[PDB]
């Protein structure tokens, strides 16, 4: 539902992969952890795992 600027971090919680996201046009204070199923950013995810 919102445009993602970049993935900052990744973690596993409750057996779910989650990404810490910086939302485009929003302050860092709005960064939130979102389960991977919530994302439609294959490019960013792909790039994150790559440079990881």
């Amino acid at each position: 539902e919102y445009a993602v600027e970049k993935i900052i971090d990744r973690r596993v919680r409750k057996g779910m992969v989650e990404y810490y996201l910086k939302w485009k046009g929003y302050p860092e204070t709005e960064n939130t952890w979102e389960p991977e199923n919530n994302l439609d950013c294959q490019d960013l995810i792909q790039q994150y795992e790559a440079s990881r």
Partner: peptide
């Protein structure tokens, strides 16, 4: 691209 905000 985009993402759902839980």
């Amino acid at each position: 691209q985009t993402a759902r905000k839980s």
